[PDB]
Amino acid sequence: MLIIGERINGMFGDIKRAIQERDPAPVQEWARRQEEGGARALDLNVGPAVQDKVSAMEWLVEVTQEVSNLTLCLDSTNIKAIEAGLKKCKNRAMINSTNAEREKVEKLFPLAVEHGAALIGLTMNKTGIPKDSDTRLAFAMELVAAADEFGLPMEDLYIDPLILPANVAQDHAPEVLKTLQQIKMLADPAPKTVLGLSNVSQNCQNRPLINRTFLAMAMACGLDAAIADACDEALIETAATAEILLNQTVYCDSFVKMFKTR
Amino acid sequence: MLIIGERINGMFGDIKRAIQERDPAPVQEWARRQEEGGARALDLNVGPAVQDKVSAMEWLVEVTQEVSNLTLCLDSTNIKAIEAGLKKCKNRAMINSTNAEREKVEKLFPLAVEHGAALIGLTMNKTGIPKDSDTRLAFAMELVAAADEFGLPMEDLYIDPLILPANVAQDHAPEVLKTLQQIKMLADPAPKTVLGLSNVSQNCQNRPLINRTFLAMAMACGLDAAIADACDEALIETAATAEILLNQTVYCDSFVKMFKTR
Amino acid sequence: MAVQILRDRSRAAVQKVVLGATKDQGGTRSHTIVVGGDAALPFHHFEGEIVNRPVIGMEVQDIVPDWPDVLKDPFTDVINEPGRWAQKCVAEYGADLIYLKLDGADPEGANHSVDQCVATVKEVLQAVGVPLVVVGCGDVEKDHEVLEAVAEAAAGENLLLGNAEQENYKSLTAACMVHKHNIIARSPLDINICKQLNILINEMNLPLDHIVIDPSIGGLGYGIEYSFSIMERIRLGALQGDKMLSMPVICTVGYEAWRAKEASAPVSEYPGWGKETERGILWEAVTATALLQAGAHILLMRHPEAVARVKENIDQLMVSNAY
Amino acid sequence: PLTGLEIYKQLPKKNCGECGTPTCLAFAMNLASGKASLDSCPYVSDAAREALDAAAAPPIAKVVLGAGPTAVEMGDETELFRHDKRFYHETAIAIQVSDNLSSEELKAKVEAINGLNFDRVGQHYTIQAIAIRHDADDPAAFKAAVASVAAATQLNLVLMADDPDVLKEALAGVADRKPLLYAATGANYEAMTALAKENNCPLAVYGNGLEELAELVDKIVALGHKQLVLDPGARETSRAIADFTQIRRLAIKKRFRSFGYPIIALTTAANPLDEVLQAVNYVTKYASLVVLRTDAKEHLLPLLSWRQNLYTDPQVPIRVEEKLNEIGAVNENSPVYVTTNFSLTYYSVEGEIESTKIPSYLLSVDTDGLSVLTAYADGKFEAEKIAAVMKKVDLDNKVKRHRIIIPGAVAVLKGKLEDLTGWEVIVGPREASGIVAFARA
Amino acid sequence: PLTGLEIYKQLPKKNCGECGTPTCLAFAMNLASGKASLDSCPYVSDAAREALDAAAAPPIAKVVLGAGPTAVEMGDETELFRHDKRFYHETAIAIQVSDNLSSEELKAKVEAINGLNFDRVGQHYTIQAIAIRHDADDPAAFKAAVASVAAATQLNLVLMADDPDVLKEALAGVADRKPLLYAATGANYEAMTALAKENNCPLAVYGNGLEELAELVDKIVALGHKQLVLDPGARETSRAIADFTQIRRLAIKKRFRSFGYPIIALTTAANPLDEVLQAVNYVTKYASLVVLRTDAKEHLLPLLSWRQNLYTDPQVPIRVEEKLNEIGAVNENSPVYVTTNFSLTYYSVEGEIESTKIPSYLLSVDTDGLSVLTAYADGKFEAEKIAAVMKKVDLDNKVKRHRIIIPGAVAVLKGKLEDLTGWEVIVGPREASGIVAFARA
Ligand code: B12
Ligand code: B12
Ligand code: SF4
Ligand code: SF4
Ligand SMILES: [Ca+2]
Ligand SMILES: [Ca+2]
């Protein structure tokens, strides 16, 4: 399980304040704090507040790698901010994200191949988020074709089956689990999968409990990565424990410590 | 998720004593503690020490149903002790257990249909515990076929794929998970499933963490019941949460408490 | 070939809620009314016991209501007197309950004082013997004061009081608990809010069987299917063992049906819609009839003829269809 | 997509291993995995191949009433609750008329039945057929009625006569429009089925209860006719509701092939108001075709409204076109209103500016069929989005004024809208019903 | 089954809906799920038949060497690591014989080869075949060599000659024994394949490298012979291990049908000791059949031990029959030793007590085939289960004395043993190797 730290996001106050007044201090400590928690990848999102996307992302990519060699997950809908971010990326990179639309596939797929970065692919059209798993699979199959087409290695494509809040969209959670399960029957080697984990508990009671429980369930269905709270120790314990129960990692009494310090 | 309380088992110190000296207080108190925790069934195991299993099982059934109306899960390898227990059961019960040995099948399947009781079926013969999920699955077909044969309702058969400790049998855990999710192919309506949950963490570090993580994983693969520690609050919360994330129960903010007081 | 009837046995039943209280119980009602107890889908006698029929409460207000003439005509003699209005509903129109809607309390309307509202309640209680349902005008501040005073004055009568809502339930719940009345929990077409509201109410120590669910129904042609499916889900939840969805269901069909243009628009303006009188009667009756199929236990109605044809429908539905 | 148990309980149970598998049970489980073909077993009955193929087929058969543009699909359903997915094919409504009636009474009723179509809330409702019942003493009166009925309407037809010889003589001239034949009975099914088969007509099957129904179906299916509609003999609402539920349940949940057909229901209430309620119950509880006797516009409208309601897709909202809608008169001095795409919202705002005769414009924004609050919350109603509409509509050309009224439940947005656009934004009433009051003010 | 991607690129690109599916990419989904069949689509190459087999069939075919009781099964493996599941079919071993040998040298050597079977720790090892090699100049020497070998043994045969007419001659007398024909090459494959088909014999196919191998296999299977064993032409250890790994991986992980067959390996080392080590590499790395030249008992025994070890089921421990077994000719004064029924455990006590030439009885307490310290930490070794079997063994009648020797690692079960048994338990060495010194004293 690859935990992608979610904290360096412009939707947060101190990250908004730091990007606005160009202060590397809060961005860099969050890069360190998440790494200490167990994250081996860091999500970078300039946010809805800041407006200079192209120049904001470049600054996040630069100040972060001054104190971190973790894989940077560039999170923006603006491609000019994404491509400009891959430029100043000395570390390994991940693109977040593309969807199942051709005007997005033609742009983001070869860009990922050219820079050799990993590519997150949302299983949705322009119309919006699918209702069931069968529709999610259709888009996931289309994302697979684009990987084989544009020459992107299958283990660098992260299929995202789009998890929704369990309070207003409860019927989506099992559909996502079914989607995760059935993704292995799209390609061989099967594409990897990822979730925006925190989305499952948006506006719910006991968000950490819901988050870590769904992580375990999703991993049991084949989840490989998760954008999540890397500073949630109970969530990290779950990821460590689930790897053991999937026989992905050899057991030892200090299994939690080993994941955290991997 | 039906939690079946594991605590009234003769292999426990305070219970072994009570059966030897017919002390009802330890049995009845555990019956109440487990129900308060969230159990809706009680496992009753005579133990290795006692000689007359019949006279022991009857007493266990008799002193338990005095303070509890929960479903009694009669647990003994002594078949004669099982039927001797069903003769004293005021409330509904289940049998634990039978394997896929034809000698055991025609000895317990009618006995389950007779008293109108659920039946746990272990996916093994005298050979031992299969490793591959396909072999576990093969024994499950036999259990399923022997239910329609003897007229046991499919939702009264509880297939147990036999979970093993994560230290010496780590590679069995993902096999158990694969077996659970492929049970959907055996029948429609699919039969029910059960695990001896605590067995997954025997002789391991942080057993509670391992137990609850595997519970969530197993439920995502279709687990219906678990013989487990009903006095483990973190385990009960996990059960509650996983039900929500499978859309088996309508979400509410107080989802944890509603499972507990169900 | 040979047909084997498919029966789905239930884990649990919807609660039994008792309305009203006789003299020996501390009230003055002539009899009580019980709703709920269903151990199957609506009127599925062949697979579970349906012990209590659904009942109808006819609406009475503490003012001459702003209703169409068609709706007023059956009450023209008594419509200005809540007591005599209630008597006519029971004695002539077969009402099981009186639904006293205190719209007169509206601070932007008649602004009837607290004392005037409890006098109206006392007037109706002295006029008929059937149990009462009482709900306020919809103004949050005003209804707090009124329903508190009503719960105090009619203590012993075991009223059904409404409406508790997600952001507004504590005061009414407390009044119901201390002075011994039942409560209506109204949620905005949302089963999650419905469920949590029942929990919040229960957590103040009002017992589960003193709560009834109002899912905020839509009228025929104006979103009724949405409330229909929520009510089927509520019933399904009840049968499967979800305690916080096992409350009996109440439906404001009188209000919702009669705000529809189709209910009262003249045939002279809408020739294709047919005569207005039986159209309006059927508009309310069809709303009730469909909702009955989704598990309604208490129907709040207005037109006496809609009421009569619905009672007859209920009568036919209560005939056992066991095999 | 086939249960290993289902596949197994259909195999010879020899364990010969000819299929390349030690036992049948292991081969059945192998089949569910999709390893070897079912043809790998040389034995097993022909019924095994039949039930296996049927198991992959839809539980309820689609059968068409009538032919051409008038034809209507019945059955073809998969759900017990619409919230699980949806219901697909709206109930077919047939108005009954008797042959005991005089010719002038017959024509007067047929003409009235033909007038049973409705327009409401942007929807159009119709009924689907006329049922001719044989009540007269002489068989010629039935042929007279059908010929009279067929000559006066283009609706679908259903012919109700027990005597096959009476029915065939009346069928001949009207067989080209595929009428439903009512009904096959344990007394006449041999003759009736031949009639249905030789004319390619849909055949109604009558049984006195579920058991009689299932057997008669099996015989008629064995005779080679599979376009059937089911009549369990239920003539009271409680018994009907139970029987229709069983037919629907057994077909869907148990794959009972005898009941894999749509249902015809007959109302029996003598009171027309009671009849409508009886019909409302039948469209709710799985009837595919219902036969009424009342033909009043007052009675059919609420029934057809409910039918439309129940059969709406719970997944997709009913939506109107995102194009300025002119109300009433068109002065060009007219106040232009703003609201969403949702049809329920749109005719609540229009039917509020039409019932109060306020000639004005109704600007229907494209919110993907979503309601005001649902569009906003989904980030589907933002001032910038509104501004594009205020120009994309091109309305500025029509009005001599640039004021825009805004949903009262979205009051905050307007100031953010007023500036960006350049129009004057007034925040109207929370509910649309307050439009009659805000205009005069 | 199969991956949805690989049926898609195999599927054309018409997007013509004739299959019943909108586009080709979705018909890929419907196939991997089990909705429709490929028979629906008119446009597809012969890859349709390939999809039928490559998906359903096991990754590695099972081909048989020989007929009747001596027949051995090759291939039919699913794993790359024994610990993931297990390896199923022990490596077949063949000793090479040359037709240059005189008629007397030939029979002496076959006699020696016939003696190449071994008994060790409860197990019996045997070799599977003799390989006859055509080295002589004149072709008649091969038929004579094959005739004399076949008359002197019932082991399976592999016939090695490049000229098909040479094989045809020898095949006349031993075809019913179903020998392996070695081998089809690019220069003789048509004649060789015709020979294999006519005689129903497994055929070895040779390629110089993986590429030639794969091409030749495809030609042979197209001629209608699928009983094949593969030789990628590797004659050096490092190349062989990589080539065998590729053949095993491509068949199992990629369903590459050209390599879906068992492997034949030929040792090349001139030093018999080097040849043995080369052979253990080959049995470790997926060879289904290896041909050796050395025929000494000293060399075969270690090789055959490793084979048995490697191919042991990792999930089920080999068990000895509980009962007590007499070491030598045991009298009524000889000792008595307690152990478990784990074959390894048991025989480490049998082999030690025998080496000291100590006549004594050994009772094996069934511990489900668990080690002394394994079962004792599981609970299946308690003082109870040792006591109960103390009578169940019938050893009471064998010895005058009643003293029990218990493993030193189980010394803690002494006091509890004596009270129940009525015997005088004694604590032996924690390791059997010291029983000699413990018996003396
Ligand atoms: C049915 C429904 C849905 C259906 C969709 C129906 C649709 N086609 O819009 C579905 C289930 C898909 C849905 C989804 C959501 N919903 Co919703 N939904 C409802 C519900 C129960 C009914 C809405 C409705 O049909 N109302 C009736 C029509 C007529 O309403 P109306 O457009 O507002 O118009 C009236 C007035 O505004 C006014 N008016 C309209 N136009 C104009 C114009 C002028 C000039 C004037 C003066 C007045 C005026 O007059 C009209 C008549 O009285 C409501 C609210 C409730 N219980 O009352 C919640 C509600 C709107 N939903 C809500 C929400 C949040 C959502 C979601 C965002 C939930 C989520 N997943 O996060 C999703 C949307 C995103 C998505 N789809 O993923 C909230 C919104 C309020 C809020 N933000 O807090 C509500 C109120 C529920 C709640 N939270 O209590 N919803
Ligand atoms: C293979 C193995 C297993 C295999 C099973 C093999 C089997 N069929 O018994 C499996 C994985 C299943 C297993 C399981 C466990 N194992 Co384990 N296992 C081993 C391992 C690696 C090898 C055992 C073996 O095959 N030994 C070889 C045979 C020949 O040993 P042996 O029977 O003792 O007999 C020799 C001597 O005792 C003596 N002897 C025997 N009989 C007699 C008789 C007489 C008269 C005399 C004089 C001498 C004598 O001579 C013999 C030859 O030298 C060992 C220890 C190691 N690395 O040395 C651990 C070991 C035995 N296992 C151990 C344990 C604890 C377990 C478990 C209980 C762990 C758990 N899961 O909780 C489980 C058992 C319960 C269960 N199954 O759930 C411990 C036991 C010691 C202890 N208690 O601390 C060990 C030592 C590991 C450790 N902790 O360091 N195990
Ligand atoms: S060939 Fe048919 S009858 Fe014989 S074992 Fe296979 S499935 Fe059973
Ligand atoms: S029939 Fe064949 S070519 Fe045509 S759309 Fe279907 S899969 Fe593609
Ligand atoms: Ca995976
Ligand atoms: Ca299940």
Give residue B247 CA to ligand 6 midpoint distance, Å: 13
Please state the domain count of chain B: 1
Question: Ligand 2 pocket: which residues have CB below 6 Å?
Answer: B 165, 167-168, 203; E 317, 337-340, 342, 344-345, 348-349, 369-374, 377-378, 405, 407, 409, 428-429, 431-432, 435
Please give the CATH number for the structural domain made up of D1-315. Answer: 3.20.20.20
Report yes or no: A157 and A121 within 8 Å, Cβ to Cβ. Answer: yes
Query: Which alpha helices (DSSP H) does D34-87 contain, by range?
Result: 46-54
Give residue A120 CA to ligand 2 midpoint distance, Å: 48
Residue E205 bridge partners (DSSP): E184, E230
State the resolution, in angstroms.
2.4
Report yes or no: E229 and E180 within 8 Å, Cβ to Cβ. Answer: yes
Report yes or no: D373 and D409 within 8 Å, Cβ to Cβ. Answer: yes
Token pair, residue B215, equals: 């519970």
Report yes or no: E339 and E325 within 8 Å, Cβ to Cβ. Answer: no
Closest CA in chain C for residue D84? C229
- Option in B137, B142, B186 nearest D3 (CB): B186
Nearest CA to ligand 4 atom 4: E16
Fold classified for E316-441: Rossmann fold (3.40.50)
Other CB atoms closer than 10 Å to residue E350's CB: what's the count?
21
Report yes or no: E404 and E390 within 8 Å, Cβ to Cβ. Answer: yes
Residue corresponding to tokens 């947060």: A12
D282: Cβ contacts below 8 Å, ≥ 6 apart: D91, D237, D240, D244, D265, D267, D290
Of D69, D289, D71, residue with least CA distance to D201: D71
Put residue E288 in one of left, alpha, beta given phi > 0 → left and psi -120 to 50 → alpha. alpha
N residues, chain C: 323
HEC-encoded secondary structure of chain C: CCCCCCCCCCCCCCCEEEECCCHHHCCCCCCCEEEECCCCCCCCHHHCCCCCCCEEEEEEECCCCCCCHHHHHHHCCCCCCHHHHHHHHHHCCCCCEEEEECHHHCCCCCCCCHHHHHHHHHHHHHHCCCCEEEECCCCHHHHHHHHHHHHHHCCCCCCEEEEEECCECHHHHHHHHHHCCEEEEECCCCHHHHHHHHHHHHCCCCCHHHEEEECCCCCCCCCHHHHHHHHHHHHHHHHHCCHHHCCCEEEEHHHHHHCCHHHHCCCCCCHHHCCHHHHHHHHHHHHHHHHHCCCCCEEEECCHHHHHHHHHHHHHHCCCCCC
- What is the rounded distance in angstroms from the CA atom of residue D370 to the CA atom of residue D316? 9
- Option in A137, A138, A186 nearest E5 (CB): A186
The sign one gets for the Cα dihedral C112, C114, C119, C121 is positive
Closest CA in chain C for residue A169? C192
Token pair, residue B174, equals: 């993902």
Q: Which amino acid is at D312?
A: T
- E strand or H helix that includes residue D405: strand D403-406
Other CB atoms closer than 10 Å to residue E111's CB: what's the count?
11
Token pair, residue D113, equals: 């039945």
Query: Which alpha helices (DSSP H) does E154-209 contain, by range?
Result: 164-174, 189-199
Ligand 3 binding pocket mutation candidate from D9, D11, D25, D31 (most atoms within 8 A of CB): D11
Peptide bond between residue A97 and the one before it cis (omega within 30 degrees of 0): yes
Burial of E67 from C-beta contacts in 10 A (0-12 / 13-18 / 19+): middle
Peptide bond between residue C163 and the one before it cis (omega within 30 degrees of 0): yes
Q: Can you say which residues of C are annotated as belonging to the binding site for 5-methoxybenzimidazolylcob(I)amide?
A: 188
Report yes or no: D154 and D70 within 8 Å, Cβ to Cβ. Answer: yes
- What is the rounded distance in angstroms from the CA atom of residue C199 to the CA atom of residue D48? 53
| Domain harbouring A59, CATH code | 3.20.20.20
SS3 state of residue E133: strand
Exposure b/e, A15-54, CB count within 10 A at least 16 = b: bbebbeeeebebbbebbeebbebbbbbbbbbbbeebeebb
- What is the rounded distance in angstroms from the CA atom of residue A125 to the CA atom of residue A155? 22
- What is the rounded distance in angstroms from the CA atom of residue E265 to the CA atom of residue D334? 94
Burial of D165 from C-beta contacts in 10 A (0-12 / 13-18 / 19+): exposed
Token pair, residue D372, equals: 């005001």
Query: Which phi and psi angles does C212 have, rounded to 5°?
Result: -125, 145
Q: What does R_g of chain B's alpha carbons equal in angstroms?
A: 17
- E25 at interface of A, judged by CB pairs closer than 8 A: yes
- A217 at interface of B, judged by CB pairs closer than 8 A: yes
- What is the rounded distance in angstroms from the CA atom of residue C23 to the CA atom of residue A29? 74
- What is the rounded distance in angstroms from the CA atom of residue D131 to the CA atom of residue D156? 9
Strands D72-75 and D62-65: antiparallel
The sign one gets for the Cα dihedral B118, B119, B120, B123 is negative
Distance of alpha carbon A127 from its chain centroid, rounded? 22
- What is the rounded distance in angstroms from the CA atom of residue D49 to the CA atom of residue D10? 9
Greatest Cα-to-Cα distance within chain C, rounded to the nearest angstrom: 70
Report yes or no: B231 and B4 within 8 Å, Cβ to Cβ. Answer: no
Report yes or no: E171 and E58 within 8 Å, Cβ to Cβ. Answer: no
- What is the rounded distance in angstroms from the CA atom of residue D181 to the CA atom of residue D204? 6
Peptide bond between residue A254 and the one before it cis (omega within 30 degrees of 0): no
Report yes or no: A160 and A194 within 8 Å, Cβ to Cβ. Answer: yes
SS3 state of residue D326: strand
Give residue C250 CA to ligand 1 midpoint distance, Å: 22
The residue of D31, D35, D40 whose CB has the most chain E CBs within 10 angstroms, and thus the best one to mutate to test that interface, is D35
What is the extent of the structural domain holding B72? 1-262
Query: Which phi and psi angles does B183 have, rounded to 5°?
Result: -65, -15
- What is the rounded distance in angstroms from the CA atom of residue C306 to the CA atom of residue C313? 11
- What is the rounded distance in angstroms from the CA atom of residue D117 to the CA atom of residue D127? 7
Put simply, the answer to whether D6 touches B188 (Cβ < 8 Å) is yes
Burial of D323 from C-beta contacts in 10 A (0-12 / 13-18 / 19+): exposed
What count of Cα atoms within 13 Å lies in the side-chain half-sphere of residue E256? 16
Question: Where in chain C are the domains?
Answer: 15-323
The string of DSSP letters for E241-310 reads HHHHHHHHHHHHHH--GGG-S-BEEE---SSHHHHHHHHHHHHHTT-SEEEE----HHHHHHHHHHHHHH
Report yes or no: A239 and A245 within 8 Å, Cβ to Cβ. Answer: no
Report yes or no: D151 and D174 within 8 Å, Cβ to Cβ. Answer: no
Q: What does R_g of chain C's alpha carbons equal in angstroms?
A: 19
- What is the rounded distance in angstroms from the CA atom of residue C72 to the CA atom of residue C77? 10
SS3 state of residue B229: coil
CA dihedral A249, A254, A257, A259 (to 10 degrees): 0
Question: Ligand 4 pocket: which residues have CB below 6 Å?
Answer: E 11-12, 14-19, 21, 24, 27, 41, 43
HEC-encoded secondary structure of chain A: CEEEECCCECCCHHHHHHHHCCCHHHHHHHHHHHHHHCCCEEEEECCCCCCCHHHHHHHHHHHHHCCCCCEEEEECCCHHHHHHHHHCCCCCEEEEEECCCHHHHHHHHHHHHHHCCEEEEECCCCCCCCCCHHHHHHHHHHHHHHHHHCCCCHHHEEEECCCCCCCCCCCHHHHHHHHHHHHHHCCCCCCEEEEEHHHHHCCCCCHHHHHHHHHHHHHHCCCCEEEECCCCHHHHHHHHHHHHHCCCCCCCCCHHHHHHCC
C26: Cβ contacts below 8 Å, ≥ 6 apart: C156
Q: Of the bound ligands, which one is closest to the alpha carbon of residue E315?
A: 2
Residue corresponding to tokens 């149970």: D13
- What is the rounded distance in angstroms from the CA atom of residue D375 to the CA atom of residue D322? 14
SS3 state of residue D149: helix
- E strand or H helix that includes residue E344: helix E343-355
Other CB atoms closer than 10 Å to residue E110's CB: what's the count?
23
Strands D289-292 and D264-266: parallel
Greatest Cα-to-Cα distance within chain D, rounded to the nearest angstrom: 90
Closest approach atom of ligand 2 to CA B164: 78
Query: Which alpha helices (DSSP H) does D172-236 contain, by range?
Result: 189-198, 210-222
Question: Does the Cβ of D361 fall within 6 Å of ligand 1?
Answer: no
- B262 at interface of C, judged by CB pairs closer than 8 A: yes
Report yes or no: A109 and A150 within 8 Å, Cβ to Cβ. Answer: yes
- What is the rounded distance in angstroms from the CA atom of residue C47 to the CA atom of residue C115? 50
Put simply, the answer to whether D5 touches B144 (Cβ < 8 Å) is yes
E182: Cβ contacts below 8 Å, ≥ 6 apart: E131, E158, E159, E160, E161, E204, E264
- What is the rounded distance in angstroms from the CA atom of residue D69 to the CA atom of residue E223? 58
Residue corresponding to tokens 């070939």: C1
B147 vs B153, B158, C71, D12, CA distance in Å?
7, 11, 61, 19
Query: Taking CB atoms and an 8 Å cutoff, what residues of chain B touch A181?
Result: 181
B94 vs B91, B101, E213, CA distance in Å?
10, 19, 60
Residue corresponding to tokens 């010889």: D165
DSSP E strands in B129-184: the ranges are 157-160
Other CB atoms closer than 10 Å to residue E174's CB: what's the count?
19
Residue corresponding to tokens 């003539």: D235
Strands of the C55-61 sheet, one edge to the other: C211-214, C182-186, C160-164, C132-135, C97-101, C55-61, C298-301, C250-252
Closest CA in chain B for residue C243? B262
Question: Does the Cβ of D429 fall within 6 Å of ligand 1?
Answer: yes
CA dihedral E228, E229, E230, E235 (to 10 degrees): -150
- What is the rounded distance in angstroms from the CA atom of residue A5 to the CA atom of residue B249? 31
Determine if residue B203 is labeled as part of a ligand binding site: yes
CATH superfamily entry for domain C15-323: Dihydropteroate synthase-like (3.20.20.20)
E391: Cβ contacts below 8 Å, ≥ 6 apart: none
Gap from D221 CA to chain B (nearest CA, Å) = 27
**Structure determination technique employed:** X-ray
DSSP E strands in D150-202: the ranges are 156-160, 180-184
Token pair, residue E384, equals: 């109870």
The residue of D309, D313, D316 whose CB has the most chain C CBs within 10 angstroms, and thus the best one to mutate to test that interface, is D309
Query: Which phi and psi angles does B129 have, rounded to 5°?
Result: -90, 115
Verify D-E touch: 3 or more CB pairs within 8 A. yes
D436: Cβ contacts below 8 Å, ≥ 6 apart: D352, D355, D356, D358
- What is the rounded distance in angstroms from the CA atom of residue A35 to the CA atom of residue C316? 70
SS3 state of residue B66: coil
HEC-encoded secondary structure of D234-281: CCCHHHHHHHHHHHHHHHHHCCCHHHCCCEEEECCCCCHHHHHHHHHH
Strands of the D336-339 sheet, one edge to the other: D325-326, D361-364, D336-339, D403-406, D424-427
Put simply, the answer to whether B250 touches C196 (Cβ < 8 Å) is no
Put simply, the answer to whether B171 touches E83 (Cβ < 8 Å) is yes
Q: What does R_g of chain E's alpha carbons equal in angstroms?
A: 29
Q: Of the bound ligands, which one is closest to the alpha carbon of residue E27?
A: 4
Report yes or no: E163 and E170 within 8 Å, Cβ to Cβ. Answer: no
Report yes or no: C221 and D121 within 8 Å, Cβ to Cβ. Answer: yes
Report yes or no: E189 and E218 within 8 Å, Cβ to Cβ. Answer: no
Q: Which amino acid is at D412?
A: V
- What is the rounded distance in angstroms from the CA atom of residue B18 to the CA atom of residue B9? 11
Question: Where in chain D are the domains?
Answer: 1-315, 316-441
Gap from C208 CA to chain B (nearest CA, Å) = 13
Report yes or no: B4 and B44 within 8 Å, Cβ to Cβ. Answer: no
- Residues, beta carbon < 5 Å, ion ligand 6: B 222, 224
Distance of alpha carbon D321 from its chain centroid, rounded? 24
Q: Which amino acid is at C125?
A: L
Closest approach atom of ligand 3 to CA D18: 1
- What is the rounded distance in angstroms from the CA atom of residue D268 to the CA atom of residue D293? 9
Query: Taking CB atoms and an 8 Å cutoff, what residues of chain B touch E368?
Result: 128
E99 vs D348, E138, E152, E188, E269, CA distance in Å?
102, 10, 15, 21, 20
Report yes or no: C312 and D274 within 8 Å, Cβ to Cβ. Answer: yes
Query: Which phi and psi angles does B33 have, rounded to 5°?
Result: -60, -40
Other CB atoms closer than 10 Å to residue D330's CB: what's the count?
12
Report yes or no: D383 and D417 within 8 Å, Cβ to Cβ. Answer: yes
Of A84, A77, A65, residue with least CA distance to A8: A65
Residue pairs spanning A and C at CB distance below 8 A: 3
- What is the rounded distance in angstroms from the CA atom of residue A92 to the CA atom of residue A98? 18
Of E170, E91, E160, E173, residue with least CA distance to E131: E160
E349 vs A175, E407, E440, CA distance in Å?
59, 10, 16
Determine if residue B247 is labeled as part of a ligand binding site: no
- Option in A141, A187, A188 nearest E29 (CB): A141
- Option in B249, B253, B262 nearest C196 (CB): B253
Ligand 3 binding pocket mutation candidate from D7, D15, D39, D49 (most atoms within 8 A of CB): D15
